[PDB]
Swiss-Prot record, chain B:
Post-translational modification: Phosphorylated by AKT1 on serine and/or threonine residues.
Cytoplasmic face residues: 15-36
Transmembrane stretches, start-end: 1-14, 37-57, 120-140
Disease: Charcot-Marie-Tooth disease, demyelinating, type 1J: An autosomal dominant demyelinating form of Charcot-Marie-Tooth disease, a disorder of the peripheral nervous system, characterized by progressive weakness and atrophy, initially of the peroneal muscles and later of the distal muscles of the arms. Charcot-Marie-Tooth disease is classified in two main groups on the basis of electrophysiologic properties and histopathology: primary peripheral demyelinating neuropathies (designated CMT1 when they are dominantly inherited) and primary peripheral axonal neuropathies (CMT2).
Shown segment, full-protein numbering: 2333 to 2526 of 2671
Disulfide bonds: C78-C84
Entry protein name: Inositol 1,4,5-trisphosphate-gated calcium channel ITPR3
Length: 424, 149
């Protein structure tokens, strides 16, 4: 309707540092293909791009420019193709029905096996189905719907993410796609082989909820330290079992219940003594002393038993075991610190030039204006796409310079720690 | 409290949180990220469900629990999957050792002794040592976050 509005919307500007180290502003029209870029991809790139040793994200942005262009082309083709576009747009929905179906199937299995919002309405329908058709038939229908929905969901996933664009090998490499095919296989196994196979599907909660994944990251980030602490605990258990076998074999008497004497020796062999110690002392608050025979004061080995029990309790139960929890808390603190630093940098730094907000105080151009218009990462991406699309003969001066820098793999054309408005 | 029943006045003791700011700040450690704690509890429930499924499939007989009958002294607690899940959730999580505490003590000559040992150790390490302590770790982290803010 408004030529000025249309042209302003479709016109962009960027700032480039020339060879003579002078800044210039290039005003260019937005390439048509750029319109197909997705907000989800934009947000993922913005929140995932990592600083380099020098502290600049420009290298990663430039590296991912080509993948972004390929994604734009694939999105244009997907929009051209109607039905698969309709399926792709509703990716979240399909995941929702899949998760709800898995939860309901697992609840029914838990509450009946062995056998023979719209959520309240779905629950009532399932209850009526159980009442009329039966538990088994209801589970069969639920599993069939789950499998169909998951097939649709994987189709929508490939349509939206466009993982196939990179290549078949890349598609196989992607971990999320493998997780999804594993989900399909588990659903098939649950439907056809055994109903209890649906239990594994409850692991989808970690994938769905970001908070739970962040919580588990506390355990996974430094799992090597936890495993090494467990190995140290095993070594200490081995030494304690050696000492017990040599000096305290008789005390190792474990009561047992025999399926159709009530006490059996447990330290006749060092392997058995190790197994007993590892299984019981580590799982007992007191330690190995609780399982070991209660000594009388008159007994000669009473001080030896007291020292043995107290040493085990202090060394293993109180120190070694608590070190794993200390490591988990430590990882929690590290993760929080890293997240806070990243959020602060993202909020109070410019992506392209890296200038801080304070530098823009008492200036004609605000920091918000700088980030929105003067230094916009998507404007730089659009300029790169323009350079790639445009023919060499039609290049202008700045376009030729930027194309030569791109060919030579030089990123200096990006403005670093410099802003034209701040200078003037 | 005045009319229906005298014991209704017990609820009024919650006014201490409102009156004291320090207690409210302490509880804020639990409440600020309560969603994470609830999701951790849900993960613990899922792991308990899987462990109960495994026990029902392979270790049904070991689930013998003693009972005191109001006017046999043992019962089978894993005859049905719901009962097995209830037993695991109620006892293993509340026992320091884990489910192996309530589970029957196996003899060495028994062929399933290594399987039972692995089951007990895996439950203790995955659930009791790691999952149950994640809630306390979350609370500790929330304390530091509140202090920094
Ligand atoms: N260099 C940058 N530094 C910091 N934040 C940036 C930078 N470039 C873009 N952003 C932010 O990233 C998001 C993308 O901005 P964008 O130009 O797409 O705005 P938009 O509101 O989605 O678009 P429009 O209003 O023109 O339809 C906005 O939050 C913008 O502030
Ligand atoms: Ca020319
Ligand atoms: Zn900038």
């Amino acid at each position: 309707e408004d030529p000025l509005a249309y042209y302003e919307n479709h016109t962009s500007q960027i700032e480039i540092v020339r060879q003579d180290r002078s800044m210039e502003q290039i005003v260019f029209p937005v390439p048509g293909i750029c319109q197909f870029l997705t907000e989800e991809t934009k947000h993922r790139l913005f929140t995932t791009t990592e600083q380099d040793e020098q502290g600049s994200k420009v290298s990663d942005f430039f590296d991912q420019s080509s993948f972004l262009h390929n994604e734009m082309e694939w999105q244009r083709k997907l929009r051209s193709m109607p039905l698969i576009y309709w399926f792709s747009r509703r990716m979240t929905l399909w995941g929702s029905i899949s998760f709800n179906l898995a939860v309901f199937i697992n609840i029914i299995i838990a509450f009946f096996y062995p056998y023979m919002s719209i959520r309240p309405l779905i629950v009532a329908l399932i209850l009526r189905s159980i009442y009329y058709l039966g538990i088994g038939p209801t589970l069969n229908i639920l599993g069939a719907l789950n499998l169909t929905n998951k097939i649709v969901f994987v189709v929508s996933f490939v349509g939206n993410r466009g993982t196939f664009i990179r290549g078949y090998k890349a598609m196989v490499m992607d971990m999320e796609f493998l997780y999804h095919v594993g989900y399909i296989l588990t659903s098939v196994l649950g439907l056809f082989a055994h109903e209890l196979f649906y239990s594994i599907l409850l692991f989808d909660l970690i994938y769905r909820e970001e908070t739970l994944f962040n919580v588990i990251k506390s355990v996974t980030r430094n799992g090597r330290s936890i495993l090494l602490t467990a190995l140290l605990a095993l070594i200490l258990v081995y030494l304690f079992s050696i000492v017990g076998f040599l000096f305290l074999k008789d005390d190792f008497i474990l009561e047992v219940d025999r399926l159709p004497d009530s006490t059996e020796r447990a330290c006749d062999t060092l392997l058995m003594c190790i197994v007993t110690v590892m299984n019981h002392g580590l799982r007992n608050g007191g330690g190995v002393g609780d399982i070991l025979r209660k000594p009388s004061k008159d007994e000669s080995l009473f001080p030896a038993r007291v020292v043995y029990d107290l040493l085990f309790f202090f060394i293993v139960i109180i120190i070694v075991l608590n070190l794993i929890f200390g490591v988990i808390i430590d990882t929690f603190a590290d993760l929080r610190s890293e997240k806070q630093k990243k959020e602060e940098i993202l909020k109070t730094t410019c992506f392209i030039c890296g200038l801080e907000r304070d530098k823009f105080d008492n200036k004609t151009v605000s920091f918000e204006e700088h980030i929105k218009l003067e230094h916009n990462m998507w404007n730089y991406l659009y300029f790169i796409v323009l350079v790639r699309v445009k023919n060499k003969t039609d290049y202008t001066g700045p376009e030729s310079y930027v194309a030569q820098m791109i060919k030579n793999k030089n990123l200096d054309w990006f403005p670093r720690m410099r802003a034209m408005s701040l200078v003037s």
